């Protein structure tokens, strides 16, 4: 019993963190096999960030200009290439600590753990959701770029995010491991609009099932609703519209608790319309949307 915002164990990712320095700029890199991946803005000075011509800036750089240090050992750079907004530094030594891994592009609403790093050293780990508007509400300071987001399935780390930027609004933006930004963002020191965000409805429902499993039941009611009726409420409260695909993914939680998905939607509808009335659910005074239905099943069953 009990339900926590749990991150994956970060060990396999800690073994991959390196420091990348180019000129006077330092950030984090991810060393997998004989390649070190890092944000391409490592080649910029703070001044260059206003409108960097990355192709031109990278042309002035040679392999020996990228200083890569894994803790205390120095890696020999034998090649460099820019793919989208990431740099790939080929090194002469494969990382002995390379876990089984994949590079994945996650969907908005999905969750992952972040291993926040500075100077190639891990500082902490936390669980994030990729917002529907492709931003993340993380915890990053200057120097944290190159820190990555990931999920783990037994012995396989799926890397889904690399940190690049903090928008003027304090929210975070980054790329997949092929250097493609999530959202409309560009790696430039310019004010950039993040789209209108919404609350991840399927995740709030999943978390309401986790609450019922763990003892918090006060919000259950004698009502039901339809996808159409619920979606009118979701529209008014800026929630993502619920689809049958969302209802389908909630299947296992609905089967375990015996609470029909639309009956849980009616509890959520009443919570949206009336608030929590000064009460809490799983230690929170708001409706939590950073737990997917898979996260709830994993934590509630003890998946390792």
- Cβ 254 vs Cβ 202: under 8 Å: no
User: In this complex, which beta carbon is closest to a copy of itself, that of residue 183 or of residue 247?
Assistant: 183
User: In this complex, which beta carbon is closest to ligand L2I, that of residue 14 or of residue 166?
Assistant: 166
User: In this complex, which beta carbon is closest to a copy of itself, that of residue 79 or of residue 215?
Assistant: 215
Positions in 9-38 near a copy of itself (CB under 8 A):
9-11, 14-15
Other Cβ atoms within 10 Å of 298 Cβ, number: 16
40 binds ligand L2I (CB under 6 A): no
β-pair partners for 162? 148, 175
Site for a copy of itself (CB under 8 A): which residue of 37, 101, 118, 134? 118
Closest alpha carbon to 164 in 30, 24, 73, 5: 30
Residue 8 has what DSSP assignment? P
Vertex 204, ends 201 and 209: CA angle to 5°?
130
68 binds ligand L2I (CB under 6 A): no
Site for ligand L2I (CB under 6 A): which residue of 93, 142, 180, 273? 142
121 binds a copy of itself (CB under 8 A): yes
Window of 53-61, 239-247, 264-272, 296-304 that interacts with a copy of itself by CB under 8 A: 296-304
Q: Does residue 296 sit in helix, strand or coil?
A: helix
Which residues are known to be catalytic? 41, 145
Measured CA to CA, the distance from residue 189 to residue 205 in angstroms comes to 38
49 binds ligand L2I (CB under 6 A): yes
Residue 263 has what DSSP assignment? H
Please state the closest distance from residue 262 (CB atom) to a copy of itself, in A.
Answer: 26
Q: What is each CA distance from 235 to 157, 268, 289, in whole angstroms?
A: 36, 13, 16
Burial bucket for residue 152 (CB in 10 Å: 0-12, 13-18, 19+): buried
Positions in 200-259 near a copy of itself (CB under 8 A):
214-215
Closest alpha carbon to 260 in 247, 244, 273, 269: 247
Measured CA to CA, the distance from residue 186 to residue 46 in angstroms comes to 16
Show the binding pattern over residues 183-222: x = contacts ligand L2I (CB under 6 A), - = does not: ----x-x---------------------------------
Window of 81-89, 97-105, 142-150, 212-220 that interacts with ligand L2I by CB under 6 A: 142-150
Positions in 230-269 near ligand L2I (CB under 6 A):
none
Site for ligand L2I (CB under 6 A): which residue of 13, 20, 44, 148? 44
Site for a copy of itself (CB under 8 A): which residue of 5, 61, 90, 188? 5
- Which residues of the chain come before a gap where C and the next N are over 2.5 Å apart? none
Give the distance from CA 274 to its chain's centroid.
Answer: 31
Measured CA to CA, the distance from residue 52 to residue 173 in angstroms comes to 17
Binding site for ligand L2I (CB under 6 A): 25, 41, 44, 46, 49, 140-142, 144-145, 164-166, 187, 189
Binding site for a copy of itself (CB under 8 A): 1-11, 14-15, 115-119, 121-126, 137-141, 143-144, 166, 170-172, 214-215, 275-276, 278, 280, 283-286, 298-304
């Amino acid at each position: 019993s009990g339900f926590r915002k749990m991150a994956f164990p970060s060990g396999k990712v800690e073994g991959c963190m390196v420091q990348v320095t180019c000129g006077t700029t330092t950030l984090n890199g991810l060393w997998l096999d004989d390649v070190v991946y890092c944000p391409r803005h490592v080649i910029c000075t703070s001044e260059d960030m206003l409108n960097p011509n990355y192709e031109d800036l990278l042309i002035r750089k040679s392999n020996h200009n990228f200083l890569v240090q894994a803790g205390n050992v120095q890696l020999r750079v034998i090649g460099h290439s820019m793919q989208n907004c990431v740099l790939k530094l080929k090194v002469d030594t494969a990382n002995p600590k390379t876990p089984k891994y994949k590079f994945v592009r996650i969907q908005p609403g999905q969750t992952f753990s972040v291993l926040a790093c500075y100077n190639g050293s891990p500082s902490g780990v936390y669980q994030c959701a990729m917002r529907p508007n492709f931003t993340i509400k993380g915890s990053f300071l200057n120097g944290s770029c190159g820190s990555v987001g990931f999920n783990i399935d037994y012995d396989c780390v799926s890397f889904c995010y690399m940190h690049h930027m903090e928008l003027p609004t304090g929210v975070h933006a980054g790329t997949d491991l092929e250097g493609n930004f999530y959202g409309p963002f560009v790696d430039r020191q310019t004010a950039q609009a993040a789209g209108t965000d919404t609350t991840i409805t399927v995740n709030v429902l999943a978390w309401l099932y986790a609450a019922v499993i763990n003892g918090d039941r006060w919000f259950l009611n004698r009502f039901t609703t339809t996808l159409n009726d619920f979606n009118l409420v979701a529209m008014k409260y800026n929630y993502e519209p619920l689809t049958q695909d969302h209802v389908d993914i909630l299947g296992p939680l609905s089967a375990q608790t015996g609470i029909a998905v639309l009956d849980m939607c009616a509890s959520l509808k009443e919570l949206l319309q009336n608030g929590m009335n000064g009460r809490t659910i799983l230690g929170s005074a708001l409706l939590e949307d950073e737990f997917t239905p898979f996260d709830v099943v994993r934590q509630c069953s003890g998946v390792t």
